Amino acid sequence: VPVYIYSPEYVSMCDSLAKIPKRASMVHSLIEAYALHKQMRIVKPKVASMEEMATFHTDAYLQHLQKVSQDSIEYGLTEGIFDYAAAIGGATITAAQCLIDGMCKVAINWSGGWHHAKKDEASGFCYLNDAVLGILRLRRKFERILYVDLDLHHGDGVEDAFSFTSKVMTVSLHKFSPGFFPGTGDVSDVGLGKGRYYSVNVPIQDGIQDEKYYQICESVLKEVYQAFNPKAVVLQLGADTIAGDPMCSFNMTPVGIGKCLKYILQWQLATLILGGGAYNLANTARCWTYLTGVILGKTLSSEIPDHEFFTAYGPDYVLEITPSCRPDRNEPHRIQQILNYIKGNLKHV
Numbered sequence: 168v169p170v171y172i173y174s175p176e177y178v179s180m181c182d183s184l185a186k187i188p189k190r191a192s193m194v195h196s197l198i199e200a201y202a203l204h205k206q207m208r209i210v211k212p213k214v215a216s217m218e219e220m221a222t223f224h225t226d227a228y229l230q231h232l233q234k235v236s237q238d239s240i241e242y243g244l245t246e247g248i249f250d251y252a253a254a255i256g257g258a259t260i261t262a263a264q265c266l267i268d269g270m271c272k273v274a275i276n277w278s279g280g281w282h283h284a285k286k287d288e289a290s291g292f293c294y295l296n297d298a299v300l301g302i303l304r305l306r307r308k309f310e311r312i313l314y315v316d317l318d319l320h321h322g323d324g325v326e327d328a329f330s331f332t333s334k335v336m337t338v339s340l341h342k343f344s345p346g347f348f349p350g351t352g353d354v355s356d357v358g359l360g361k362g363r364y365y366s367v368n369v370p371i372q373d374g375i376q377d378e379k380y381y382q383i384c385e386s387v388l389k390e391v392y393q394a395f396n397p398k399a400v401v402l403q404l405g406a407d408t409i410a411g412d413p414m415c416s417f418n419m420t421p422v423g424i425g426k427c428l429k430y431i432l433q434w435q436l437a438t439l440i441l442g443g444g445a446y447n448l449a450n451t452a453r454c455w456t457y458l459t460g461v462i463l464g465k466t467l468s469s470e471i472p473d474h475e476f477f478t479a480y481g482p483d484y485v486l487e488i489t490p491s492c493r494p495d496r497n498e499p500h501r502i503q504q505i506l507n508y509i510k511g512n513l514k515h516v
């Protein structure tokens with residue numbers, strides 16, 4: 168039975184210092200309104216210790232972050248932000264611990280996925296890279312970890328953490344366009360040194376929809392699985408790809424993301440599920456509730472059930488999201504060229 172990382176205090180903490188308010192409450196409240204929590208093993212998250220956070224971040228960065236939370240320019244830098252970051256990092260580590268111990272094959276921290284943070288630098292509103300911390304916890308048991316990042320943005324912090332190693336392969340599908348954050352992650356970015364070809368990047372343009380996205384994702388993950396043979400997976404599912412997000416870049420629905428998730432779940436590997444960037448509150452809850460249903464194999468009712476935040480689901484009050492009427496800017500020949508480039512990189516793996 169999947170593990171669901173959750174406590175009322177954790178959700179309150181996540182919404183107190185969140186970049187987007189009440190997002191954690193709405194996601195959990197919708198999952199609860201669909202009664203999906205009854206089909207999962209609810210595990211209270213522990214708070215990450217200083218030593219656990221220092222598995223990736225430097226002592227100087229963690230000490231400075233802890234002080235200002237009580238030369239910030241140097242570390243890419245709010246009251247209480249350190250306890251917030253330690254709570255989210257501890258939640259992802261707790262999920263990874265559940266996977267190590269064989270408590271489950273899928274463990275979910277929807278409030279995690281803060282993929283931009285570097286060892287000594289906050290970045291992209293990420294003060295602590297819980298995805299890296301979770302991978303490093305999984306490295307206690309699993310020899311090869313696959314990190315898949317389906318956020319709108321390039322998972323640069325996670326890729327940079329493992330750029331020099333072949334024990335962790337990072338795969339990011341993201342918007343890539345001059346001026347678009349964080350600006351890295353071209354298909355030519357393949358890692359460095361012993362990690363060369365163990366970073367995979369799929370640059371994508373505005374307006375992609377469910378069918379073409381899944382064709383790209385399935386093609387990449389199929390070749391990655393055969394070449395890399397991962398023993399565990401960490402999957403980042405930032406909902407800022409979803410139609411109606413203020414980012415207004417991709418044109419996805421949770422159904423397309425869900426097919427990517429299903430393809431990974433079929434591998435039967437230990438799988439750590441994370442959230443990520445997401446800026447439409449109601450659509451974020453829609454997406455991650457639906458994806459929770461996919462994890463559980465359950466079909467959900469279309470009408471948003473009556474619950475605390477029902478009035479936020481206008482004007483339609485249904486779970487389904489409709490794509491926006493705007494163009495797909497992705498040229499099929501550019502996409503194929505990217506797929507050819509990646510296939511050639513993975514022959515080296």
Ligand SMILES: CN(C)c1ccc(C(=O)NCCCCCCC(=O)NO)cc1
Nearest residue numbers: 291292318319320348405407443444445
């Ligand atoms: C209030 N408002 C509309 C905004 C405030 C800040 C930014 C921004 O700094 N953007 C640059 C940093 C982008 C970080 C993206 C985080 C993300 O989703 N990563 O996956 C933009 C808009």
Ligand SMILES: [K+]
Nearest residue numbers: 316318340341
């Ligand atoms: K991504």
Ligand SMILES: [K+]
Nearest residue numbers: 329332335365
């Ligand atoms: K790597």
Ligand SMILES: [Zn+2]
Nearest residue numbers: 318319320444
């Ligand atoms: Zn994002």
